[PDB]
Structure formats: structure tokens, C-alpha cells
Design a protein around this ligand. Structure first.
Ligand SMILES: C[S@@+](CC[C@H](N)C(=O)[O-])C[C@H]1O[C@@H](n2cnc3c(N)ncnc32)[C@H](O)[C@@H]1O
Lengths: 328, 92, 88, 108, 76, 98, 108, 94, 83, 99
DNA sequence: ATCGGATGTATATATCTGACACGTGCCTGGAGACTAGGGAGTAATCCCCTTGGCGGTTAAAACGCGGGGGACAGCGCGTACGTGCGTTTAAGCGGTGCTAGAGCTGTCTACGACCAATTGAGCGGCCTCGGCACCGGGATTCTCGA
DNA sequence: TCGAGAATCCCGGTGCCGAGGCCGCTCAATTGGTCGTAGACAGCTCTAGCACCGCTTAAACGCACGTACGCGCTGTCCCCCGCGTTTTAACCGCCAAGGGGATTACTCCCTAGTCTCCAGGCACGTGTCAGATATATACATCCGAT
């Protein structure tokens, strides 16, 4: 009726009901469990030697005993090497961030247990700012590696959706506190389930993340003018926001500090921005825009590569414009 | 008592190139340019109000007529230029 | 579950080699180089994504989510191509 | 009452909003004209004229001239990729053509 | 007597009629109680298409009979 | 055995398809092509079935008329086979690639 | 009063003068519409439709058909020299193409 | 709910005067409706532009006539002018 | 007052001068009667439309705007003469 | 014994001369006579503003120069250097004029 | 050039379905009659600008000679495309079912047309200086024959 | 590989007319109300678009041979380019005359608008024949062989 796994780092055990939560046509998530064992197999790189002699790649998951030969034995044969829990060497420190392969598995696993009907995410007004789309694991990993977040930056995702972007950032960056705000009620409802489920599968592997908060709200409100300007790095997926609210975001971004980073789907400033007397109040005056390297499967609504752009606030460009306006 | 855009084209030079001029032969080409894209945008926005059985041309019909007529990056920066002027007109 | 959209991926292959022969036979051509088919899949790639996008943007102006037969007519007839029989 | 402000000044524009609004009413385009429609349209026409005068003033400087001649408007439009798409069916009087010799024609 | 006018949507209504009432009178009473116009109604009695000129007693309709309503619309 | 000379069956297919009016692209791969170009607009689109037939009728009329000009460019160069530089020379004079 | 005569019947036409007059008033073409303008325009549209149906009914007879099919409209327009000038930028659905093989391609 | 309008009654009357024994399919009648609506918008759109060039606010049969000369090729424009003037002189006589 | 054979006033040096703004470096001898036939067909189409704009205005002078209007409805719109 | 350029050198020098200038290339009085004799077949005594004859010439210059650009592409496509009458006919056929 | 085998193709008769074409009732849009107001027809007048002619200067067109480069035909070779046969992939079809969204009606309010009064922006005319065109004289470069 | 020679760019001067700034003055845009209706919005309904299913088989895919076409090479020759002399007429500047473009005033007849009315065209239903299909046969077309 159920089947249980035990944590290596002493956390609460897991639950898998025998009326299985099959999700798509064929991933039929016992593949979730047999791949969950393989990441705890090397944490701790000695489950492969502790469990070589009897197991092999096995089909026929429709029987209850095929998991049962694998799962309670995993609750049992863990103690062939867990038994060193006392006396001379502790297990792994909880202050470890996961690898990119482990983090990809946890974020896929937290997504499967959280969203129940992903076709509900398509319930929006057409061509509105509230359309839904996602950024893949590979672009956010590109985004984290091509900004350089120090130990004092603050990350905010405007329009966080279900919140999978801030979970990858909070588990791959040593910063203070991260935020995500979402207006639409359907992905913000899944974001609360996504919030709880990320934490309990994070102590289960025994890994730390930075602290975060997923909120409901509208970032175009007066509460958010003060706290957009006080953050260091901003992620936003503005692909279908439209020009009326992209114009509103520019006059919130104009109060950011020096070295303020902005990663967006569409640019807030041209790549070939020439400054003259006609566009001195534009936001491209005070920022430098570069296009990141595009990768395959970068977004979730199309298959072709969509490239996101990087914005860096510097108020040393308009001065260099003013440093050649005087002597001729 | 005949009108043109020559006063207004000459103001846009001094913002862009503050120490160049135009000849009068090329000012007349700039007046032919402004009248041409006036009747392209207003002609396409007239059909958009008629396809949807509306009787009013608003700033939304001008916006989607710009997106039909201008190519690529011209349409991106004319839409952001037009929405900046409308939101400044309605907040003043 | 997974996911909110099933992404269609290639679909230009799609327009196959014995379908380009038998578009060129109506054009009246007798012999065809082997490099035509990749050239022809790129033209019908540029075309038909100029028609759509100019077909959508008539759909979003009508607030309407469903691109109809009109707005394909009006997409064509804007690019200098008038199509009869769908019908305006 | 208060001193009159033009609609171009409160929109932050250089082109006349009131003249564009009159030309939309007297052009038989629709029965009725919204209030933001001449503000939006005058901003697009001011943007498009600022791009040509940007590029034509650069072409006048490359020939060491301080005035824009119809040749400089021709060189500006045909060397910009997107201005050449708008004005591809447009001929400019006393504009000439771009210098372009096919590479086969050059001597060996 | 009464009849049952079943629709194609799943709605079966109870209408108090008389055998001298025509099909034109049946199509007039549903507009009085449901708001459906007379050019949007087709009636079914054992596979027949009923005509406005004849009455209910001309087609041998017993009380508590199931009449089906095919929804015609002006265009398509 | 029996075997036609090359060019004979090809001329037989000129007469076959210039006589008919049918669509020559398969309908489900074309419809699947249309729905994946429209994925670039983020939002969900629905495509009334008469609109996909209007796109296919126009795309095939575009390509048949393009192979007619492509064929004239190959005959002009004293060739009988069409070649990718014939498509490029036809689309440049027509005013498409420039 | 006297029994009503349609404006098509007193002009000797088959096309509706009163419907064309309504479409000119509701199409934003001018502020005002003259009385002879829908009579003139309905006679031109009736003339142009009588030429195509002349030539397409001849094309339907050459294929031993008694109904006009979109192929017969295509064969009528493309074989007439002046109907091909009007409808040169027009594609007709399920119309096909004219049979035309270049003389170089024919076998020796 | 709203009823439609087309030229299908009138195209069918012209066809019986020209070929009284032939018929027409429904897809060919939809192309003839597209043809009449296309030539209507060309003539009325050009005649609208002629009244604006000459600073007039009315469209008369003089402006339909010269829009027919601008749009139709040579012999089509010759016969369509003669068909149009024949209808106006019959309309204004009685 | 009758005026005839003026395509020969468009000379061989003038057609050669037009081909070299077009980028042609060598010209066969049969080009010059082709170019006069192409230019006659082009001028007949524009003047026919320009004269029927000035007949409708009830004038006897072909103005520059009649030429600009005639060129615009052939796709060949032209800046620099008042349009 | 006199100086003598090889054939093709002066022609390329004339490509660069006339692609730099913006002047009209047809003589003005022979062009004006041609306009006045084509117009005799439409209306009997026309009057022709001098700006209208210059608008007709500026359009005819631009039509022919753009036609010789496409004519030149058809001659290179046939691996030639000379333009021939079949190059003009192919260029007008694809453009949609000769048909 | 002719001949026969084989493959395609046109020919004729049957049979069968669904779409054209006809008919009927009905409602809404076109027609008849009338009034009021202004668009344009009509005339008259002004003066701009088009036409016609003239003469002189000289740039450009025309004519011819001469020679080399390019068009064109022919030939030979190798490759890549057509033809056809066997294998394999998925299109097409028909049928079922859900549900959503496009189309519709009914309130209702905010937005734009209309009108009147007022004034400053833009247009016309006006000086006037400087950009640019012209002219000449110098250096630099390119083509061509060695 | 290098000197002659013919174009071409570069560096200054003179002269000028067209672009730029100033000013005076209407008239068109702004201000301010006001009304009525277009459009936004909520609710409701049911057509049609999406998705799935299994099956049949049309069509795509893959393979292999061979043929004919692309393409490169060579040689001929004539036609096109370059140049110099002569000839023609474009071009400029000027004068003169008058058709007709452009404007203004006046008034009339034509069109918008209104209400009443009624008949033509639309929706709906129904029956039959045109055309599609199939099969079998007749015959025209291609191609290897002689
Ligand atoms: C394209 S989704 C991005 C989801 C997430 N950031 C990701 O890439 O995985 C953009 C989201 O922004 C949300 N959004 C739009 N306007 C918003 C606003 N004004 N305040 C908060 N969220 C908003 C919409 O609900 C939409 O779901």
C-alpha cells in the first residue's frame, strides 16, 4: 500500500502510495524512485560497493514486490555503511550545496509533487501580461554563472510563476535572502505547495540553501517601488508583458544602485544605443546591455533557442557623454 | 497660409545634429516622407477599426498598425516611443 | 505533472522530398538538383512565418486567441497576395 | 483661466499633436477619433524622422558637408537595413544610387 | 394534459397543453417559459418532424410523452 | 525488362500535376508545421481549420509560382536542372532577398 | 402612392443599386454620395462578372461539364489577356495552373 | 444569429443570361463573391481618393468613371465605361 | 506642330550612361533598341494615368502632382516634387 | 604609340563616375519632346508644368537604372559579361512586367 | 525508318450519392414622399507661367578606324539525378467526446463630438552672412608597356 | 620586376545665393462645458476546435544501376571598346504674347435625413441529377531491336 525511504542525514522518511501518481503518458514515476537512489548512491560514494552483489537493472514495476525488494532493503542495506554513524566519523555536513546534477533532480522532483494539473497554468487572458512560460534549468545555471553574485547581493524574481527560478538561485548562491512575487492566483497557489515541498526534500538529502520567500502581489504597486530599488540583481521574464508595463518597469529600475544587474527575456534598452540630446531621460543612458549565449531548450513554450539579455547599471556613461560636450 | 512639417523637422535636427542643416530640396523630401507614413499608418488603422466593427480609431489601433507596417527593430522602438508619449500625456 | 505545453520541435522535415518534387512539377521543371530541398525548406520557412505574425496581431487586436480564416485573408492581401475563396 | 499648453508640450514631443488630430478628422479614416491616437501617431512620426536625420547627418559628415543634401538622404536609407524595407518602393529625386560593382567585373 | 419537452442539452420541461393546441402553439409556450424563439425549435415524436399546421391529437400524442427538441439556428 | 528513359516519367508528371488542382503537401505535417511556428508567441493559439487550409493554399501557390521563375533562370543559363542559385536569382529580381 | 420600383430595374441592371449605395455610405469613402454613383458602379460590377462567367462557362463546356468549378474560373482568367492584368496578384483556391511546358524541355 | 449578405442571387442571375444551361458550384460562387467585393474596394477606394485630391466631399458618377479608367486595362475600361454611362442615362430618363 | 520620332533623341551615349550607373561594364549592340522600347512602354503607362488625373480636374495642364499620383498607383512612389 | 587603355578599364572608370553623381543622364530637350508626343495620343493640346516633365524624367531615370541592375545579374548568371536583350526580357519577366 | 511488345491512357457503360436548385414563408432593408441647408456649379476677373522664337557658345553626339577580348561552339569526362523495386513509416479516416470560447444580449458610464470664446504659435516677408561651388596649382596614384 | 603618362585626390583663393535668423500678424489650436452614444462589461449559450482511438494502405524511405547532363577546356572570330575628327543641336539667356490656373461671389439644385411602408432576399426544407467512381476494353505512346 505504501513504500518508504530513509534519509542519510537523519531527516523524516518519505511516502510513496501504491496507487501511484503517474503524471504523463510514460514516465510513470517509479523512475523517480530508482533515480532518487542513484543520487544518494554517491554522496557518500560507497553505496555502489555496498549494493553491487544483488541488484541489477530490473523491469516489471507493476508488481508490488519489485519495489519492495528494492525499497525496504534500501532501508536495511543502508546500515551496512550507515553503522559508522557513531564513534569516529560523522556523516556529511549539512552545510553543503548540491551539485548541478543533484539540483536538477531535486527541482524536477519538487515540481512533480507540487503541480497536479499543469494545464491549469494555461488559464489566462490571451496576450495579457499574465501569460505563463518557464525558464529551463540550463539558462538559470547560465544566468548564475555569468553574473557574479557576492556574499551581499539580493535576488528578486519579478513574476516568479510557480517559483522554480528562485529555488535554483537560493540553492546555488551564498546570498542573504531571495524573493519572488506573483500576481496570478493559480501559479501562486502552486508556489505555496512548491515552497513546502522544496524544504522537506532539502533536509532529506541534507543540503543547505539560502533563505527565500515566495509572495503574492503586484510588483507595480507602491510597496515594490522602494524594494525594487534596494535589490542588487533582478530576474524578470518580460517576453509578453507588453510595452505599457515594460515602460513602468523602466521607471522603477532607474533608482537601482551602481552594479545593479537585470536579466530579462526582452531588452529594456537597445544593444546599439546612441545617446544624444533627444534620449537623455531614457534608461539606456545609465545601463550597459549584453546578450547572453543562447542554448537549446532555454524556454518552455518553444523549441528554438531564446536568448536572455543582461543589463548592468552604471552612471559613468552619461558623464562620459558629458565629458565630451564642453570643449568643441 | 500653406502648411508643412518644415518647422518640426528642423527642430528634430538640432536635437540630433545641433550644427548641421538641410537644403530646401531635401526638406521637401522629408515632408514627402512624413505625409507618406501618415497615410500608411492612418490607412491601416482605418481598416483595423472596420474589421472589428468599431467606429473609433484609438491609440491601440495606431499601435497595431505600427506593428504591421514597420519592419523589425523599427516597430519595437516606435511602439515604446509612442507609449511613452501617451502615458506622459495622460499624467499631465 | 509534466508539462504545461508539449513542444513541437522539427516539423519542417515534414515538407518532404517527394512533396517538393510535385510542387516543382506544377512549376514545370524537368530535373532537380539535390540541394534544392534544403533551399526550398528555408523559403516557406521565411514565407509562412511572415504570414503568421501579420496573422496573429490581427488576432490579438480582436482579443481573440483563435486565428480565423479571415486574418489570414487580411494577412495575405496585405503582403500583395490576394486569396479568393475563404472569403472576403 | 490658466495659460494654454499645447498638446505636444504635455506629451513631451516636437511634432504637432493638434495638427495630426485635425488631419485624422478630415481624412475620412473613421467616424470618430480617440484622444490618445494623435499623441501616439505624432510620437511615431517624430521617431522615424529622427532616425533618418541621424543617419543622413552622419552621411553629410563623411563627405565633409554641414548641410543635408538629397544624396545624403539616399545614402542613409539604402545603407540601413530596416529603412530600406520601408522605402524600398520609393525613389528619391536627385538621390542617385549606392556605389556597387559586382566582383566578377573587377579586373584580374 | 401535460407533455415533456426534452432538449438536446439535458433539460426536460413540463408544459400543460391541450390536444387542440397546434405545434405552433407548443412552440409559442416554450418562449413564454424558457425564452427560446420559434425559429429555433424542432420537435420529435417517434422520429417525426412536427408541423405547425396540425395539432397534438393529429399525431397520437399521449400525455406524459417524451418530445425531443432539435436546436436549429439561423446560420452556422 | 522494360524501363523508361530518364526525363520521360518526369514530363509525364508535368502533365499530371498541371492538370489537377489538389493540394500537394500532406495536410497533417503542414498543420503541425503551422502550429510550431505559432509557438513563438508564448500565448496559446487555436487555428480555426479553415485558416490552416488558407495557409496551405497560399504557401503552395507561392512555391509553384517560385519554381516557374526558377525554371526560367535555369533555361537562361543553358541548363535543364534547377539549382539553388536559380532560386536565389529569382528571389532577388522579384524583390524578396535583395 | 405608386407601386415601388427598385433602382436596379429602372437602370436596367441585375446588381442591386440600393445595396451598393448603402456600402458606399458605410465604407468611409466620402462625406457625401451622389445619386448616379451607385448606378454607375453596379453596372461596372455586373459587366465584369458577366465576362468571367462568359469565359468560365466556355471552359466548363470544353471539359464537358455543366457546372462551373474553381478550375474553370482559373482557366478563364489566365487565358484572357486583360483579366490576367486585373487578377495578376490574385491566387484562386483549388484553381491550379495553366498547362505550360517550356519548348527546351521537350524531347529531341 | 445574424443573417448574411452576398452577391450569390445576383451572380446567378447574370449567369442565366450568359449561359442559360450551365450552373455553378458553391465553392466557385464563393470565389465570385470574393471577386465582386475586391473590385468594389478598388473602385470605391480610388474614387474616394479622387474626391480628396480635388477637394470635393461627394462621390459622383464622374469619379466612378475615372476610377474605372485608372484601374481596368485597355478594352475592359472601354466597355465598362460604356456600360456604366448607358445605365445612368437610362436611370435618369425614367 | 506634329511631333514624331523622338525615341531616337534618347541616344546611344545616354543609354550607355544609364547602364553604367546600373553597374554594367559591357553592352551588346542590340540593347539600344530594347531600351527604347522598354522606356516607351513605361512612359505610356505613366502619362496615360497622369492625363486622366488632369482630365478629371477639368484642366489642360499636366501638373507635377498628377505625375506623382500616377506614379504612386503603380507602386513607384516618388519623393521631392510635392507629394 | 599613343596611350591606349585596355578595353574595360575606361568602362569601370565610368561605373565609378556615374554611381558617384546624382545628375540626370538623358538630355532634357529630347526627353521633353518624347513626353509631348506620347501625350498627343491621349489629349490634343496639353500644357505640362516644367516640374512635371522633371518628375517624369526622374522616374524614368530610376526605372531604367534599376532595370540594368537586374539585367546585369541575369548576364552574370549565364556566365557572361555583356548584357544582351534576353537579359532584359528575363528581368522583366520575373519582375512581373513582361509576363 | 520501320516493327512489335508493353505500358500508359482514353473510351464507354453502370451505379450511386450529396449538393445544386427550387419553393415557401417572413422580416428587414430598400423605396416613396417630404423638408432644409449647403456643396458645388457658374460666371467673371487677375496675373502667373507656359509657349514660341532667336542667337551664340560649346558640350556632346556621330562617324570611323583598329584591335583584342569575349561569346560561342565543340569535345570529353565524371558525377549525380532519374527510374524502379522492395521495405517501412505515418497519413488519412471515421467515430466518439469534452469543453471552451466565440458570439450574443442587456445595462451603463465615460469619452469624444459639437460649440463658443480667446490668444500665441507658425507663417510670410525681410535681411545677411557663410557654406559651397568654382578656379587653379600642386602632389599622389593607377594603368600599361616594358 | 620599373619608368611614362594619364587620372585623381589634395591644398588655397574668390565670389555668391541660398539657408538661417528676426519680426509682424492672423487663425488655428486650446479652454471650457455639455450631451448622447459607442464601447466596456457581465452573463449566457452552444458550435467547433482539441484530443484520442484503431485500422487500412497510400505514400515516404531507402537502395542501386546507368545514363545523360553539368562542367571544364580549347579554339575561332567577330563584335564591342577606345580614340580621334567632324558635326550637330543642347543649353543658356533673352524677349514677347496670351492661355488658363487660381480665386471670389452668388445662388440653385442636389443630397442628407426623416417617417411610413412593403417586397425582395434570406433561411429552411426537400428531391433529383450531375459527376465521381469502377471495370473492362480499345488504342495511342514509348523504346529496344532490326
Ligand atoms: C512568463 S511567467 C515567468 C515565470 C517564472 N519567472 C519563470 O520564468 O519560470 C511571468 C509571470 O509574471 C506574472 N506577472 C505579470 N504581471 C505581474 C505583476 N504586475 N505582478 C506580479 N506578477 C506579475 C504573470 O502571472 C506570469 O505568470
Amino acid at each position: 500500500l505504501e513504500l518508504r525511504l530513509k534519509s542519510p542525514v537523519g531527516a523524516e522518511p518519505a511516502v510513496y502510495p501504491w496507487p501511484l501518481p503517474v503524471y504523463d503518458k510514460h514516465h510513470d514515476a517509479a523512475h523517480e524512485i530508482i533515480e532518487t537512489i542513484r543520487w544518494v548512491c554517491e554522496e557518500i560514494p560507497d553505496l555502489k560497493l555496498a549494493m553491487e552483489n544483488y541488484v541489477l537493472i530490473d523491469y516489471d514495476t507493476k508488481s508490488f514486490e519489485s519495489m519492495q525488494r528494492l525499497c525496504d532493503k534500501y532501508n536495511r542495506a543502508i546500515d551496512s555503511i550507515h553503522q559508522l554513524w557513531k564513534g569516529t566519523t560523522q556523516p556529511m555536513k549539512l552545510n553543503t550545496r548540491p551539485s548541478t546534477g543533484l539540483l536538477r533532480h531535486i527541482l524536477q522532483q519538487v515540481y512533480n509533487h507540487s503541480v497536479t494539473d499543469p494545464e491549469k497554468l494555461n488559464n489566462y487572458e490571451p496576450f495579457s501580461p499574465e501569460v505563463y512560460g518557464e525558464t529551463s534549468f540550463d539558462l538559470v545555471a547560465q544566468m548564475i554563472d555569468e553574473i557574479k553574485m557576492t556574499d551581499d547581493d539580493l535576488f528578486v524574481d519579478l513574476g516568479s510563476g510557480v517559483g522554480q527560478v528562485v529555488l535554483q538561485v537560493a540553492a546555488a548562491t551564498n546570498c542573504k535572502h531571495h524573493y519572488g512575487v506573483e500576481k496570478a492566483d493559480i501559479p501562486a497557489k502552486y508556489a505555496e505547495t512548491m515552497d513546502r515541498e522544496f524544504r522537506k526534500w532539502m533536509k532529506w538529502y541534507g543540503k543547505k540553501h539560502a533563505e527565500y520567500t515566495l509572495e503574492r502581489g503586484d510588483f507595480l504597486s507602491e510597496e515594490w517601488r522602494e524594494r525594487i530599488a534596494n535589490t542588487s540583481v533582478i530576474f524578470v521574464n518580460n517576453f509578453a508583458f507588453g510595452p505599457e508595463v515594460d515602460h513602468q518597469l523602466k521607471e522603477r529600475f532607474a533608482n537601482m544602485k551602481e552594479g545593479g544587474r537585470i536579466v530579462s527575456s526582452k531588452p529594456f534598452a537597445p544593444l546599439n544605443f546612441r545617446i544624444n540630446s533627444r534620449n537623455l531621460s531614457d534608461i539606456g543612458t545609465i545601463m550597459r546591455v549584453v546578450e547572453l549565449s543562447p542554448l537549446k531548450g532555454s524556454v518552455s513554450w518553444t523549441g528554438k533557442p531564446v536568448s536572455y539579455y543582461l543589463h548592468t547599471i552604471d552612471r559613468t556613461i552619461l558623464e562620459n557623454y558629458f565629458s565630451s560636450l564642453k570643449n568643441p | 497660409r500653406k502648411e508643412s512639417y518644415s518647422v518640426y523637422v528642423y527642430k528634430v535636427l538640432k536635437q540630433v545634429h545641433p550644427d548641421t542643416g538641410i537644403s530646401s530640396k531635401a526638406m521637401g523630401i522629408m515632408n514627402s516622407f512624413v505625409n507618406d507614413i501618415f497615410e500608411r499608418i492612418a490607412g491601416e488603422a482605418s481598416r483595423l477599426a472596420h474589421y472589428n466593427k468599431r467606429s473609433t480609431i484609438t491609440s491601440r489601433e495606431i499601435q497595431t498598425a505600427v506593428r504591421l507596417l514597420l519592419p523589425g527593430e523599427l516597430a519595437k522602438h516606435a511602439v515604446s516611443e509612442g507609449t511613452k508619449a501617451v502615458t506622459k500625456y495622460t499624467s499631465a | 505533472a509534466k508539462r504545461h505545453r508539449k513542444v513541437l520541435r522539427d516539423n519542417i522535415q515534414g515538407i518532404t522530398k517527394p512533396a517538393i518534387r510535385r510542387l516543382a512539377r506544377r512549376g514545370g521543371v524537368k530535373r532537380i538538383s539535390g540541394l534544392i530541398y534544403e533551399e526550398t525548406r528555408g523559403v516557406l520557412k521565411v514565407f509562412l512565418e511572415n504570414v503568421i505574425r501579420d496573422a496573429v496581431t490581427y488576432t490579438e487586436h480582436a482579443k481573440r486567441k483563435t486565428v480565423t480564416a479571415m486574418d489570414v485573408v487580411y494577412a495575405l492581401k496585405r503582403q500583395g497576395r490576394t486569396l479568393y475563396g475563404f472569403g472576403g | 483661466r490658466a495659460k494654454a499648453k499645447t498638446r505636444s508640450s504635455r506629451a513631451g514631443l516636437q511634432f504637432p499633436v493638434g495638427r495630426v488630430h485635425r488631419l485624422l478628422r478630415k481624412g475620412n479614416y473613421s467616424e470618430r477619433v480617440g484622444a490618445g491616437a494623435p499623441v501616439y501617431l505624432a510620437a511615431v512620426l517624430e521617431y522615424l524622422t529622427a532616425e533618418i536625420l541621424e543617419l543622413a547627418g552622419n552621411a553629410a559628415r563623411d563627405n565633409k558637408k554641414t548641410r543635408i543634401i538629397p544624396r545624403h538622404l539616399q545614402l542613409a536609407i539604402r545603407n540601413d537595413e530596416e529603412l530600406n524595407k520601408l522605402l524600398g518602393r520609393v525613389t528619391i529625386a536627385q538621390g542617385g544610387v549606392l556605389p556597387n560593382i559586382q566582383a566578377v567585373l573587377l579586373p584580374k | 394534459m401535460q407533455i415533456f419537452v426534452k432538449t438536446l442539452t439535458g433539460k426536460t420541461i413540463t408544459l400543460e397543453v391541450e390536444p387542440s393546441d397546434t405545434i405552433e402553439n407548443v412552440k409559442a409556450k416554450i418562449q413564454d417559459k424558457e425564452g427560446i424563439p420559434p425559429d429555433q425549435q424542432r420537435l420529435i415524436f417517434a422520429g417525426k418532424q412536427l408541423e405547425d399546421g396540425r395539432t397534438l391529437s393529429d399525431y397520437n400524442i399521449q400525455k406524459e410523452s417524451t418530445l425531443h427538441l432539435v436546436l436549429r439556428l439561423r446560420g452556422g | 525488362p522494360h524501363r523508361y528513359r530518364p526525363g520521360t516519367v518526369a514530363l509525364r508528371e508535368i502533365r499530371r500535376y498541371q492538370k489537377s488542382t489538389e493540394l500537394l503537401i500532406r495536410k497533417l505535417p503542414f498543420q503541425r508545421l503551422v502550429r510550431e511556428i505559432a509557438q513563438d508567441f508564448l500565448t496559446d493559439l487555436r487555428f480555426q481549420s479553415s485558416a490552416v487550409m488558407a495557409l496551405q493554399e497560399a504557401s503552395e501557390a507561392y512555391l509553384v509560382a517560385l519554381f516557374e521563375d526558377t525554371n526560367l533562370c535555369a533555361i537562361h543559363a543553358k541548363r535543364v536542372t534547377i539549382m539553388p542559385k536559380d532560386i536565389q536569382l529569382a528571389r532577388r529580381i522579384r524583390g524578396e532577398r535583395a
